[PDB]
């Protein structure tokens, strides 16, 4: 569906490669409808027995493909609205998103399993769902955001990548505009842009190695982290400025420099998120019918 | 010093342009601090805000009033807010709704009618408050016996709380019963069918005794029967009654035989008193292998010959056990620091105790093992001291269990009926718990029970407060209704269970009946103990007929009257009860009124919304136990009061210790002037301030009993259905 | 003939738990290890209810 | 699918029973997706031989 975003969004599309991914699109609707819950979860379940359970990341990520349902084709918005109440359901007496851990492959979650990550992740994905910045939800999400924020900022090490990232996307769709400069200042003060030289990271060894041969379980996030800081970078509502969107490009020019062209990539969320990238930073940098200028 | 507790009984069903009602608390140290109810939309927005102010020991619960929704169904946030002066808290949920409908029924002016007649209806409109009720219906019609809509009228303002029209029918008997359909604006259809047929009367119907159970050890039946008709008149006549035995041994799959035995009883009835005829059961086989059990009566005449039937009993069916025991006080929950004790009820086969049978009181896992006997209603009183397991069964039986009386039963059972019964004690860590004792037995009503509970502070009070009180609670209808309160001052260390309440079943209650109590403490620790409480319907608004009785000069000025109220109104019915005696009623009754009730019990939650859930099991937990003992952490499954709150269907909102701390698994896991008959009277009518000063048309010698229906609608109070009475 | 037993699993307060074993020789096994024995007022053999 | 072509042609129909007949319509219809043939035929097959 994100590759159908994007092509509808390049203006590059066929309506046969269309009704064929309609199909697909369909055939995986149907398949997951096959796999819904008693009470409006998602996960590899053993339900009709009622003491069983659901997942929270995996349900993240089902509620954001309904919503790209929805963006082009019919889904019930009664799920939407079951899975969200799922996600009410499954806080703290006081805090934020736990991690209900009932899942077959640890590989696909690139997160530091903190309650208060997760929880920013789901919430910023319904900042997407039409709702306030101040619901209650997304409200105990924000507090738990600023505890994650102090303990980053005023320590000096917070994972260093993960954390932070999704901590300026979740601020910065707040509403916030100078902090998100300041988050600006902080990484790229924590950068490798060369003068003369293509490269985004630092020398990639884990603070805590498990297996320490080929990195088991860490996809590495390596475009994954710059882009979802450029994906919060492109956003302003009523027109972004011209330095943000020239960096932005020059560092899309930095990112496809550091990505490939051989179709799908070793894993699936980097692929996704820079599938968000390149989707809205094209429908973004032009338009879809001027096309005759003479500069 | 106390942290401040707050505890709230408000139900999670908010519903859509009515009123109920819900209970908010607050205690310990300081009470300067506003809470605030916010209903709002789980999906969009319906602003629904509540701020609250009160002090400490206040429960003032008050029934709020919701406006109409927009959605079909949905469930909505109610964040509500509390400011600690150290701290802050909050909570959510999701409170469900539920479309909603008025109610209704149809009385039918008779079940008999000729070519070209026309049909007398009413209706009924009301809301789960039975406040008397005025809507319009898009939709209405009678309904041909084929499925098509009859009398039609659309959106009609329906002033009385229930409109009656009528509807001529044809003089093309189109032979069948008819019904009616009705639906709201909302769209939800409801239907009343009501028989319409036509033939002569059998002018007299047989009455006939029979036992009315049947068990194991049977010899011999009775049978009596006496002559009628109408106007109760005596009658000679005779009878051949075929009663027989079914289900002959074959397959009988209509390849072979299906009549089993047949006895036929014949005999004669004197011209003015009754006949008797007895009967056995070999003869009919009572065998271990049968089917169900027919057992019909029928009557001819004299002089005129003509016969009479009834079908009775199709399935007096011979138990797989021979007592009728069961209990009769006894319940599911208790404590071991109580020890519980109730009542059992010995009954044998067909509704009898006898006395003189000693039987054996058997406590397994109670260690609790001891006889009794059947007193002259064999009642027995057993009591159980308990400091014992978390669960256990329970069960009192006459006859030795050691081989399962008839020896083994690798084959077909046959038993005692053995009142059986599992309670599982209330989980009480601090062991300072709330019991309470239900008289769970024929509850009245116009009476206010003594009901002793009992009150356990274990562990006492150590830094705390002296003044304390609890919140006791007088509620029925499916809500929310009337409350109180005790009040006593703790001791350090005393736990006495000396307290008796007043709980008054008076008016505006409904058969419906539990209650709650509760004790909270400063500690961070809350105990609570519902029960509920099988209330018959005795009514709430007063209605009890009353006739100008069997009485000469029988002209109109015959002045009924039923009570009523200076403000209400009354839909008014006479009727002859003529066909109504040729079958009999269909609930023509307020049971069918009370069991119409859609969600009549505030209890239970749709499938999709679940619980709210927390965080409290422990991350690394191994035994890490030494000492006098050595013992692992391992769990127990017991109730909470969580699950006192999902029983009530009723949410709450505490920052105290409720949620049983329950560990987390691992994922290694498994040229006369006659008037017109069967309708004196059909007219909606103004009770004046003395009852109704009735003037109705009157007539001698209608040999007859006269339904006099009468259901009468007060504003300042509420609905009104009474017991119709006969006229003569 | 020493014995504990209370029927419940019988552990009050923030967990329910019944008893259990341990794995580790006592002071009674300190005279099985030597392989002698004694008779005694003092408590030394486990107290296994 | 033929009694949504019924009410589409009474004149009696809502966009509800509308959205959960179109979710049962692709339910179905990926299902038999799943049963088609090699050379595109439908049966009760054991295909891939
Ligand atoms: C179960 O329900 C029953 C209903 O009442 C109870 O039965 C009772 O059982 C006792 C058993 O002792 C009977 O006691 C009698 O005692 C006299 C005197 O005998 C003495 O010596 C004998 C032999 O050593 C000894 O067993 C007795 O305890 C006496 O010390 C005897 O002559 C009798 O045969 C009989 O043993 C009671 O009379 C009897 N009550 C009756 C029959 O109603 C029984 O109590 C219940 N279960 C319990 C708690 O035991
Ligand atoms: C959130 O609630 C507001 C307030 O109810 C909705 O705005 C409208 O407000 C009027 C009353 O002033 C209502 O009668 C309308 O039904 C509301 N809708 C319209 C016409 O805008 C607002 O729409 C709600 N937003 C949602 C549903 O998310
Ligand atoms: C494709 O792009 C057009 C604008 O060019 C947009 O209006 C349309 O909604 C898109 N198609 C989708 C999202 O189905
Ligand atoms: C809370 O209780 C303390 C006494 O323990 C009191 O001094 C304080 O005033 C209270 N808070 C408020 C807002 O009154
Ligand atoms: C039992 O049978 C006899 C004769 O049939 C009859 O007189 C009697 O009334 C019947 N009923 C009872 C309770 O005895
Ligand atoms: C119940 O019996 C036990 C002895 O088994 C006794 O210790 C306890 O006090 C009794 N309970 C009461 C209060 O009668
Ligand atoms: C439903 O009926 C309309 C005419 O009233 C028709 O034009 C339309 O195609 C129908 N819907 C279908 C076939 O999807």
């Given at each position: 569906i994100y590759v159908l975003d994007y092509l509808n969004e390049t203006q590059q599309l066929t309506p046969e490669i269309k009704s064929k991914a309609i199909g697909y699109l369909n055939t995986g609707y149907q398949r997951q409808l096959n796999y819904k819950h008693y009470d409006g979860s998602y996960s590899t379940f053993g339900e009709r027995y009622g003491r069983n359970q659901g997942n929270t990341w995996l349900t993240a990520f089902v509620l954001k493909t309904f919503a790209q349902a929805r963006a082009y084709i019919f889904i019930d918005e009664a799920h939407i609205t079951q899975a969200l109440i799922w996600l009410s359901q499954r806080q703290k007496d006081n805090g934020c998103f736990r991690s209900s851990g009932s899942l077959?492959?640890?590989?696909?979650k690139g997160g530091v399993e903190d309650e208060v990550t997760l929880s920013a992740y789901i919430t910023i994905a319904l900042l997407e769902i039409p709702l306030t910045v101040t619901h209650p939800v997304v409200r105990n999400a924000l507090f738990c955001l600023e505890s994650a924020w102090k303990t980053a900022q005023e320590g000096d090490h917070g994972s260093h990548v993960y954390t932070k990232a999704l901590l300026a996307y979740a601020f910065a769709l707040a509403g916030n505009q100078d902090k998100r400069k300041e988050v600006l200042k902080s990484l790229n003060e924590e950068a490798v842009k060369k003068d003369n030289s293509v490269h985004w990271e630092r020398?990639?060894?884990?603070?805590?190695?498990?297996?320490?041969?080929?990195?088991?379980?860490?996809?590495?996030?390596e475009v994954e982290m710059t882009s979802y800081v450029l994906l919060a970078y492109?956003?302003?509502?009523?027109a972004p400025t011209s330095e943000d969107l020239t960096s932005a490009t020059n560092i899309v020019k930095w990112i496809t420099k550091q990505q490939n062209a051989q179709g799908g990539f070793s894993s699936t969320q980097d692929t996704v998120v820079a599938l968000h990238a390149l989707s809205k930073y094209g429908a973004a940098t032009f338009t879809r019918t001027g096309k005759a200028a003479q500069v | 010093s106390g942290k401040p507790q707050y505890m709230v009984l408000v139900p999670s069903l908010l519903h859509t342009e009515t009123t109920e009602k819900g209970c908010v608390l607050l205690s310990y140290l300081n009470e300067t601090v506003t809470v605030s109810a916010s209903l709002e939309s789980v999906r969009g927005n319906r602003s629904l805000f509540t701020d609250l102010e009160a002090e400490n020991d206040?429960?003032?619960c008050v029934a709020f009033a919701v406006p109409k929704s927009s959605s079909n169904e949905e469930v909505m946030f109610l964040t509500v807010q509390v400011k600690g002066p150290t701290q802050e808290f909050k909570k959510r949920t999701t409170v469900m709704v539920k479309n909603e409908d008025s109610l209704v029924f149809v009385q039918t002016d008779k079940s008999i009618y000729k070519p070209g007649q026309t049909v007398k209806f009413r209706v009924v409109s009301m809301d789960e408050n039975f406040h008397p009720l005025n809507e319009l219906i898009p939709l209405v019609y009678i309904q041909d016996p084929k499925g098509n809509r009859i009398a039609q009228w659309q959106s009609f303002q329906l002033e009385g709380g229930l409109k009656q029209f009528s509807f001529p029918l044809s003089s093309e008997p189109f032979q069948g019963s008819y019904k009616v359909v009705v639906q709201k604006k909302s769209g939800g259809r409801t239907e009343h069918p009501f028989t319409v047929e036509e033939f002569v009367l059998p002018k007299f119907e047989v009455q006939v005794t029979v036992p009315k159970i049947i068990t194991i050890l049977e010899e011999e039946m009775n049978v009596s029967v006496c002559g009628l008709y109408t106007y109760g008149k005596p009658v000679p006549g005779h009878v051949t009654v075929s009663i027989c035995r079914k289900y002959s041994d074959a397959s009988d799959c209509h390849g072979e035989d299906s009549q089993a035995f047949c006895e036929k009883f014949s005999g004669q009835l004197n011209s003015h008193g009754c006949f008797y005829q007895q009967v056995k059961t070999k003869v009919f086989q009572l065998k271990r292998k049968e089917y169900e059990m027919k057992l019909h009566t029928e009557a001819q005449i004299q002089e005129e010959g003509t016969v009479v039937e009834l079908t009775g009993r199709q399935s007096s069916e011979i138990t797989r056990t021979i007592t009728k025991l069961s209990f009769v006080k006894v319940d599911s929950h208790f404590r071991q620091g109580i020890p519980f004790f109730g009542q059992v009820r010995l009954v044998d086969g067909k509704g009898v105790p006898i006395p003189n049978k000693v039987i054996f009181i058997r406590g397994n896992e109670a260690n609790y093992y001891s006889n009794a006997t059947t007193d002259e209603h064999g009642l027995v009183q057993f009591s159980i001291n308990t400091t014992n397991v978390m669960g256990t069964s329970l069960t009192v039986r006459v006859n030795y269990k050691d081989r399962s009386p008839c020896y083994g039963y690798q084959w077909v059972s046959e038993e005692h009926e053995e009142a059986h019964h599992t309670a599982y004690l209330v989980f009480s860590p601090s062991k300072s718990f709330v019991h309470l004792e239900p008289m769970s037995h024929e509850l009245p009503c116009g009476h206010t029970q003594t009901v002793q509970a009992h009150y356990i502070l274990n562990g006492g009070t150590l830094l705390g407060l002296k003044k304390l009180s609890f919140y006791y609670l007088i509620m029925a209808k499916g809500g929310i209704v009337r409350t109180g309160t005790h009040g006593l001052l703790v001791k350090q260390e005393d736990m006495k269970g000396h307290f008796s309440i007043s709980i008054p079943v008076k008016s505006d209650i409904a058969p419906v009946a539990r209650l709650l109590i509760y004790a909270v403490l400063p500690t961070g620790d809350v105990i609570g103990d519902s029960a509920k409480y099988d209330v018959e319907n005795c009514l709430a608004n007063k209605v009890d007929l009353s006739f100008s009785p069997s009485q000469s000069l029988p002209a109109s000025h015959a002045h009924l009257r039923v009570t009523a109220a200076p403000q209400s109104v009354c839909a008014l019915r006479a009727v002859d009860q003529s066909v109504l005696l040729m079958k009999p009623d269909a609930e023509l009754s307020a049971s069918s009124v009370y069991n119409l009730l859609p969600e009549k019990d505030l209890t239970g939650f749709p499938g999709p919304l679940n619980d709210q859930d927390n965080e409290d099991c422990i991350n690394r937990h191994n035994v890490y136990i030494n000492g006098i003992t050595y013992t692992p952490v391992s769990s127990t499954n017991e109730k909470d009061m969580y699950s006192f709150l999902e029983d009530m269907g009723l949410k709450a909102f505490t920052?105290?210790?409720?949620?049983?701390?329950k560990m987390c698994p691992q994922l290694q896991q498994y040229t006369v002037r006659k008037y017109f008959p069967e309708t004196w009277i059909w007219d909606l009518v103004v009770v004046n301030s003395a009852g109704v000063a009735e003037v109705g048309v009157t007539v001698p010698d209608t040999i007859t009993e006269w339904k006099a229906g009468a259901f009468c609608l007060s504003e300042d109070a509420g609905l009104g259905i009474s017991s119709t009475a006969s006229l003569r």
């Open positions: 077959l492959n640890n590989a696909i020398p990639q060894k884990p603070k805590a190695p498990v297996g320490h041969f080929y990195e088991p379980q860490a996809p590495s996030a492109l956003t302003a509502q009523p | 206040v429960l003032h920052n105290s210790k409720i949620r049983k701390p």
